[PDB]
Design a protein around this ligand. Structure first.
Ligand SMILES: Nc1ncnc2c1ncn2[C@@H]1O[C@H](COP(=O)(O)OP(=O)(O)O)[C@@H](O)[C@H]1O
Ligand SMILES: Nc1ncnc2c1ncn2[C@@H]1O[C@H](COP(=O)(O)OP(=O)(O)O)[C@@H](O)[C@H]1O
Length: 203
């Protein structure tokens, strides 16, 4: 089975993907995580991607599509978490899967309002050692655990990332709706509840 998690930044897509991968054995493909590790290690991809990400812009499709080809696993169920982000990327994903005898089974659309995305993103914190994602209010780091805020979770980059989401990524909703595989998730609910809905959606 192949899943795509779609929706605004801060919706809780990564948090759910990591849980689903962990408990149910999906391969988690987070273009976010892979890009950040590239940036940190300073690869050709990392150096090229770094500024797009810092500014809240999408990294160019060619770079991402190639990144997906490089990481797509030969076997196993897959969660596409943060990819595709454009219509071009969605077309590429279809072709790539079709060549492998595959297809996207379910697109979970993580619906959540702007005030919730801003609330979620501004309080997001990261454990630099473990990659564990926290939230200053909803799931705070344990006492004594040093965390960081991502530079792209600053107020003005969030604002940009949301315009970019609405401009470039939101058309994917009709794209997958037209195929009859769009599932709606009420992402505004607490973590446990969203996860139950995710499990119910996918069986
Ligand atoms: N599929 C993609 N296509 C283009 N750029 C991407 C993609 N995934 C991630 N990025 C870059 O990485 C940044 C952070 O993405 P990500 O971590 O997936 O979302 P969020 O920051 O909302 O969790 C994006 O703003 C974008 O610049
Ligand atoms: N259901 C939820 N309720 C409250 N906070 C959440 C929920 N899901 C995730 N979060 C928190 O909100 C922020 C965004 O979650 P994340 O999974 O990183 O979003 P995305 O991957 O869609 O950008 C994180 O700080 C996370 O701890």
């Amino acid at each position: 089975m192949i899943l795509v998690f779609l929706g605004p930044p801060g919706a809780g897509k990564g948090t759910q993907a990591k849980r689903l991968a962990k408990e149910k054995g999906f391969v988690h493909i987070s273009t976010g995580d892979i890009l950040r590790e590239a940036v940190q290690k300073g690869t050709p991809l990392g150096k090229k991607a770094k500024e797009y990400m810092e500014r809240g812009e999408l990294v160019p499709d060619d770079l991402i599509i190639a990144l997906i080809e490089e990481v797509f696993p030969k076997h196993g169920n897959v969660i596409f978490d943060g990819f595709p982000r454009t219509v071009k990327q969605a077309e590429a994903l279809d072709e790539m899967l079709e060549k492998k005898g595959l297809k996207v089974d379910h697109v979970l659309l993580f619906e959540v309002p702007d005030e919730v995305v801003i609330e979620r993103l501004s309080g997001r914190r990261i454990n630099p050692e473990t990659g564990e994602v926290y939230h200053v209010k909803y799931n705070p780091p344990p006492p004594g655990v040093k965390v960081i805020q991502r530079e792209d979770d600053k107020p003005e980059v969030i604002k940009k990332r949301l315009e970019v989401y609405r401009e470039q990524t939101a058309p994917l909703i009709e794209y997958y709706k037209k195929k009859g595989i769009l599932r709606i998730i009420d992402a505004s609910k607490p973590v446990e509840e969203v996860y139950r809905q995710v499990l119910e959606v996918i069986g």
